[PDB]
Curated annotation (Swiss-Prot), chain B:
Taxonomic lineage from the root: Viruses, Riboviria, Orthornavirae, Pisuviricota, Pisoniviricetes
Name of this protein: Spike protein S1
Whole-protein coverage range: 353 to 401 of 1273
Subunit structure: Binds to host ACE2. RBD also interacts with the N-linked glycan on 'Asn-90' of ACE2. Cleavage of S generates a polybasic C-terminal sequence on S1 that binds to host Neuropilin-1 (NRP1) and Neuropilin-2 (NRP2) receptors. Interacts with host integrin alpha-5/beta-1 (ITGA5:ITGB1) and with ACE2 in complex with integrin alpha-5/beta-1 (ITGA5:ITGB1). May interact via cytoplasmic c-terminus with M protein. May interact (via N-terminus) with host bilirubin and biliverdin, thereby preventing antibody binding to the SARS-CoV-2 spike NTD via an allosteric mechanism.
Protein's organism: Severe acute respiratory syndrome coronavirus 2
Gene: S
Function, in words: Attaches the virion to the cell membrane by interacting with host receptor, initiating the infection. The major receptor is host ACE2. When S2/S2' has been cleaved, binding to the receptor triggers direct fusion at the cell membrane. When S2/S2' has not been cleaved, binding to the receptor results in internalization of the virus by endocytosis using host TFRC and GRM2 and leading to fusion of the virion membrane with the host endosomal membrane. Alternatively, may use NRP1/NRP2 and integrin as entry receptors.
Domain of life: Viruses
Amino acid sequence: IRGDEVRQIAPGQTGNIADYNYKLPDDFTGCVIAWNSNKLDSKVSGNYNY
Amino acid sequence: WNRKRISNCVADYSVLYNLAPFFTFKCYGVSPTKLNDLCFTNVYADSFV
């Protein structure tokens, strides 16, 4: 997911991707780990697979 | 500062939330996800560098 909408995916947080794809429940005991992977995910002239 | 008065209008914070200048949206007293569900008398905005 693009870095603007990484913060959207959270329990009790509303958004476009956060609401229209999957919510996180309010009793979520768990972890979220992120990494900015520009080496593989970013492609020349756009990555249109996703 | 340039204090701008905001009144007599419908405030759509989803436009700001989907906007590209969007970083460190900190809030005191109000949860940022419930700002579309409230009413205010006047809203004062201060813009600076």
